[PDB]
Amino acid sequence: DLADLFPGFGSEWINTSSGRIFARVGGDGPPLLLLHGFPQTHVMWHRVAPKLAERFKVIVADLPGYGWSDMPESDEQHTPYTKRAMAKQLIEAMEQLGHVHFALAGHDRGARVSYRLALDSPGRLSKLAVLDILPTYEYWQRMNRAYALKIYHWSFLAQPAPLPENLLGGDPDFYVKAKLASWTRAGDLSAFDPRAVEHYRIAFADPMRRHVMCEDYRAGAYADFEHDKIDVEAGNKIPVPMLALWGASGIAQSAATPLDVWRKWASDVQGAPIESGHFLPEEAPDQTAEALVRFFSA
Amino acid sequence: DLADLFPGFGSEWINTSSGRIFARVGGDGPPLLLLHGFPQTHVMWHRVAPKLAERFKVIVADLPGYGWSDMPESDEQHTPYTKRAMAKQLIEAMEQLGHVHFALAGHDRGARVSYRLALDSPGRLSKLAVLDILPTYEYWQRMNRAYALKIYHWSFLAQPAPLPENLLGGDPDFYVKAKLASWTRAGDLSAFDPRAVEHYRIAFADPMRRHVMCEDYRAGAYADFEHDKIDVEAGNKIPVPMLALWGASGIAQSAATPLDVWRKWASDVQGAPIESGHFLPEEAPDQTAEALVRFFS
Structure with missing residues (x-):
């Protein structure tokens, strides 16, 4: 018994060469793809998507391997869960809908797909919004004691299977509730809709889903970092207009200033702190939706 | 149940202000305290302690909170499981045996206790051996992507309780078998005596023991680091003559060249790699035992 947190939204099973993407689809207008992160599913957008759907065709997709999207078989390089592969799969998904040029907002892992998508295929994107991330390279490059403790996960x-899988199974x-609570401003689950929490908890209850998330983070430690590094070293910048939103007490702000980081990564970036923990669309949905509406509309 | 891996060694429950320290005691001569690390107990010394007992009064102690030693309740600062507190508790234990000046060899967490003992109370140590560690400060200061992946634990x-506890409990x-195996040269349990593995597994099966180990690591990420940081930034060096042993495939060598690091921390340090993974006394008992005998003699 899982709640429908997007009333009026359709539910699309969208075929790709690597498996189906599940998406809620609502609204009309320019296509806007919304990508969740860890340890959530598309339903994390449930408070923000209705206001976006007032002006956009909002596609709220489960990342490959997350939520209800199919789980591509991984390999030794975790290829299907590299943000590059995930980006390609979502591009293919959007093409199945006739969307070859779209707006894109990602949170957490989906924001990593998002900026990698913008680096690999900037022509696909009209505008990009990333929520409470710095590029994966930056996390690994600023890796120190403080960061290691804060983003220990x-x-x-990224430890070799099945070490995190076995421990997560413990x-x-x-x-999943610990991650949700610990990354909010409140430090508990009160910022979340309980029915959303149920979605995340059921997704996290599936061992195969958890393995995918480990594959995602294994990718994030290896191929994703290596991909980012190539762009840093080549000076490759995101040419799409982008919005960087971060929680005042989110993962990205402490020991950086995300905007001055993203300015190293994008030619044309606006940014603003949102009074929130990591889960901007759920802890501060009105502020997040407003900034997304404003940035994506004009 | 558990095998006696120190035939002829006595068993001692040493009372301290912070709880009883369990120790096997054997041999005769100058007192030598042997301290294990994580996720082990005093029995990790069972292949080298006999050789050492031919020359020394060998005291093979379970760290405070580990093995059969008592588990002082921790606090928000993980105080009893900081290496400073553990060192003071083991000094107390040794004082109970009349050992106010002793040799000390530690491995892993026990080596962290040991060098902290040497910085805090060098007058207690004749000589010091640390096995396959760098100072806790050095691990954290070299915590980049490579090393953060290698010593993710x-x-x-160090995550706030009960997160590691809850995951470990399933x-x-x-x-415990994953950790023992992954830090060996071979990457399995072949280097360990199966009876020793059973000691480790049994200790690890106790949720309070696991909590203690997490407290140890929490201290390692916080208070221990802070204490080290004070010393390194004050230029406080271990004055006790010391031996740094590391495994060629152990943990210490990954962060940096161990002897170079230890010379920043110790005024009188010699060093030798041993072809071993992290668990020198068990993967390389003869080489470890010979290095320890040579140094302490």
Whole structure:
């Protein structure tokens, strides 16, 4: 029993060469793809998507391997869960809808897909919004004691299988709720809709889903970093107009200033802090939706 | 149940203000305290302690909170499991045996206790051996992507309770065997005596023991780091003559060249790699035992 948090939205099973993407689709107008992160699903957008759907064709997709999207078989390089592969799959997904040029907002892992998409295929994007991330390269390059402790899961989940999978299995309900709570401003689950939490908890209860998330983070430690590094070293910048939103107490702000980081990565970036923890669309949906509406409309 | 891996060694429950320290005691001569690390107990010395007992009064102690030693309740600063507190508790324990000046060899966490003991109370140590470690400060200061992936457990086990505890509790045996195996040269359990593995597994099966280990690592990410940071930034060096041993495929060598690092921390340090993974006394007992005998003699 899982709640429908996007009333009026259709539900699309969208075929790609690497498996189906699940998406809620609502609204009309320019296509806007919304990509969730860890440890969530598309439903994390449930408070923001209705206001975006007032002006956009909003496609709220489960990342490859997440939520209800199919799980491509991974390989030794975790290729299907590299942000490059995920980006290609989502591009293919959008093409199945006739969307070859779209707006894109990603949060967390989906924001990593998003900026990698913008680096690999900038022509696909009219505008890009990333929510509470710095590029994966930057996390790994600023890796120090403080960051290692704060984003320990970047190294923990990247451990070779089945070490994180076995440990996650030790208490999956606790773990997913722990991540959700610990990354909010409040430090508990009160910022979330309980029915959304149920979606995340059921997704996290599936061992195969958890393995995918580890594959995502293994990619994030290896191929994703290597891909980002190539762009840093080649000076490749995102040419799409982009909005960087970060929580005042989110993952990205401490020990940086995300805008001055993203300016290294994008030619044309606007940014603003949102009074929120990591889960901007759920902890501060009105502020997040307003900034997204404003940035994507004109 | 558990095998006696120190035939002829006595068993001692040493009372301290912070709880009883369990120790096997054997041999005769100058007192030598041997300290294990994570996720082990005093029995990791069972292949080298006999050789050392031919020359020394060998005291093979479970760290405070580990093995059969008592588990002082921790606090928000993980105080009893900081290496400073553990060192003071083991000094107390040794004082109970009349050992106010002793040799000390530590491995892993026990080596962290050991060099902290040497910085805090060098007058207690005749000589010091640390096995396959760098100072806790050095691990954190060299915590880049490569090293954060290699010793992820430094950050994972330091997460606020009960996160590591809850994950470890689902299958404790998997984790302790995964850790023992992953840090060996071979990457399996072949280097360990199966009876020793059983000691480690049994210790790890106790949720309170696991909590203690997480407290140890939490201290390692915080108070221990802060204490080290004070010393390195004050230029405080271990004055006790010391031996740094590391495995060629152990943990210490990954962060940096161990002897170069230890010379920043110790005024009188010699060093030798041993062809071993992290678990020198068990993967390379003869080489370790010979290095320890040579140094302490």
